[PDB]
Symmetry: C5
Subunit: 96 residues, 5 copies
């Protein structure tokens, strides 16, 4: 999975029926030094993440492995909110 | 899913039977600041997008999760038209 | 799918039994302006493409969605030959 | 699979029920000359890797092919610890 | 599939039980001019490839499509040894 920051929300009204009831979050990817990358995903959110929160992004078919998501055209899923990222130097990120 | 812009259409006559009846759109990828990326996909369209419209593109096997698309050789699917992209600074895109 | 140009053929005699009978083509990827990229794929061909033709390349598990290809270790499939690619400026490519 | 080095651990409390019981490690990718790349994965660890150890990282759907990981949203899985990497020049890495 | 050259072997003893009996090869990717890329893969070998040999590498779920590899955590599989690569200019590689 990828470390990412929540940038915003994506509203789509004309879409597939399998995408109805999915909250779509724009999440920008982060590198190993907590810095922002160009790579992003518009991900479905099953965890309740908010602006600027650091999150875990599952890609590919992994994004369809939650209770009611097996038939949805989901590429990328926000599968958790990050409290801390701990490296050898110490904490790279602490939400508090 | 990726933010992308509809560039045009791709016509292929000599193709696989499973790719018959699929409208093929050339959709150029967009980054987090709504700028055009080099990455693109020739994606099947299941929503009815047109030139210059901003759309959501599902990749890999997600592309095959619509009613009759399970045995088609689809990599990439246009799964929705984008009305709005809202960030912390405000609206990044509004179709109107 | 990706736009690609047929570069040549790959011959392999020492290979997996599931790759027996598959025509292997070296297809170099093309960008949105019909320009050659560094990215490529050795793809199986199920359409009958030839040198310098422009083609549609299906990646990942999409490449195994044709009649007898479900158990073959194929990553990339040439799933169609391109007649035209039409943009806002006009035709980007016409095979004639 | 990719060569990677364990950088640290990722704690997430707000997460999907399918990620409960999975150890999350931040692993930085390494190149063919044992050098660290920008690419990384936050991967589930099924083998018991520790800080600085060199590891094998399975990506995509491969990451869900362990006894009880079929229904989990994993896109990356640490599937082994590397003892040695042997090239033509000789040993590129020896854990001892 | 990618054109790649065999660099060496990867030995791992502390690993998942589904990776037992898999020969692990470090294969460096090659571009369309036969030149070495930075991209690489630690691939399983089901064909019997050797040092410096040119090979075809299947990525993703394609790497689990051989007889007994359906439940293995394989991302990359060496599915064939390349005899020749033929371009418009002529032969790019001949074993």
């Amino acid at each position: 999975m990828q470390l990412a920051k929540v940038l915003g929300t994506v509203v789509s009204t004309s879409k597939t029926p399998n995408l109805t009831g999915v909250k779509l979050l724009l999440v920008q990817f982060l590198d190993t030094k907590g810095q922002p990358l160009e790579r992003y995903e518009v991900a479905g959110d099953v965890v309740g993440a908010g602006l600027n929160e650091w999150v875990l992004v599952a890609r590919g078919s992994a994004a369809r492995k939650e209770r009611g998501n097996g038939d949805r055209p989901l590429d990328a899923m926000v599968v958790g909110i990050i409290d801390t990222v701990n490296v050898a130097s110490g904490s790279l990120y602490n939400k508090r």
